[PDB]
């Protein structure tokens, strides 16, 4: 996250972190329930093996309260397309359930129609993660958050060198130096309604970070609510 600020205790509790073989964070995720994490499909191709860390606030110290969960099932969206990042979504079922605690709680999945008319029509959403605090800088050891304005689809499309499908939206600033960045991919974009935070996007891609004339591109979660429900219906192994 470029700009924004550190998440305070309990402020960004649905943040998950995908950690690779070396136990380094490489992508983010969103806690959806005790057994399910939402992330980006593209992230799956960026580590040989991975696990999920929850409740991490600073990666440089073992503060306690962090937990690492092994992945039981990876449910990549079968329509994920590598050249466009269309259908950039995946769900992970964990081997052992998450113990909800301080700094560890699920974000709400909204109802599709209500989300379209009530969440996507807000001024802003919040993006978070451990990603680079600058395009040219280094990954944050501290979880950050950033309020990002929703950008209308037309302005989104004309700002971009690459195709913006209907399963993507733009959020962020034209020239203000605040954005998500590399390392934030897979992480939450949430929209607040009456003191309750709902999942509205997944950090997907962008040209640079906080580039002038460019926005952050997010997987549009409303397109995928029905697919997420189906993936989560499976529940545990038969």
């Amino acid at each position: 996250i470029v700009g924004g600020q550190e998440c305070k205790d309990g402020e960004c509790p649905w943040q998950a972190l995908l950690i690779n073989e070396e136990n380094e964070g490489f992508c983010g995720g969103t806690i959806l329930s005790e057994f399910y994490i939402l992330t980006a499909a593209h992230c799956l191709y960026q580590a040989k093996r991975f696990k999920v860390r929850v409740g991490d606030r600073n990666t440089e110290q073992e503060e306690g309260g962090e937990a690492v969960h092994e992945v039981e099932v990876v449910i990549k969206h079968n329509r994920f397309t590598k050249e466009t990042y269309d259908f950039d979504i995946a769900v992970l079922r964990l081997k052992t359930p998450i113990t909800f605690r301080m700094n560890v709680a699920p974000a709400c999945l909204p109802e599709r129609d209500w989300a379209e008319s009530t969440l996507m029509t807000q001024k802003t959403g919040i993006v978070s993660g451990f990603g680079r605090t600058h395009e040219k800088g280094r990954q944050s050891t501290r979880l950050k958050m950033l309020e990002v304005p929703y950008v209308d689809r037309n302005s989104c499309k004309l700002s971009s060198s690459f195709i913006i499908t209907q399963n993507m939206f733009c959020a962020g600033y034209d020239t203000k130096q605040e954005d998500a960045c590399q390392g934030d991919s897979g992480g939450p974009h949430v929209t607040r309604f009456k003191d309750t935070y709902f999942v509205t996007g997944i950090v997907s891609w962008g040209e640079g970070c906080a580039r002038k004339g460019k926005y952050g591109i997010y997987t549009k979660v409303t397109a995928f609510l029905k697919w997420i429900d189906r993936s989560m219906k499976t529940r545990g192994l038969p």
Binding site: G10, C12, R101, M102, A105, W114, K194, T196
Partner: protein
């Protein structure tokens, strides 16, 4: 007293005793609303069934008896920043 609207009852420094379905000082405001206005008074989800609002709640909440509020089922309901 005709200051009270929509067949509201005027008393008096006047007061209005509004008919059900109406509010405001002069019963001039419909309480019955669709989801486009104040989220239809729902705490969370709002959707319409035959020109009428039905509220719902996300995972780990139950709809209150009033049909508007969402009641948590535990200390960690979805979408709440953790206090403790």
């Amino acid at each position: 007293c005709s200051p009270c609207q929509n067949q509201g009852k005027c008393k008096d420094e006047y007061t209005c005793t509004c008919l059900e379905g109406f509010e405001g000082k002069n019963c001039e405001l419909f309480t019955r609303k669709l989801c486009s206005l104040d989220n239809g008074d729902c705490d969370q989800f709002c959707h319409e069934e035959q020109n009428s609002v039905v509220c719902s709640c996300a995972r780990g909440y139950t709809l209150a008896d009033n049909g508007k509020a969402c009641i948590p089922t535990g200390p960690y309901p979805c979408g709440k920043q953790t206090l403790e």
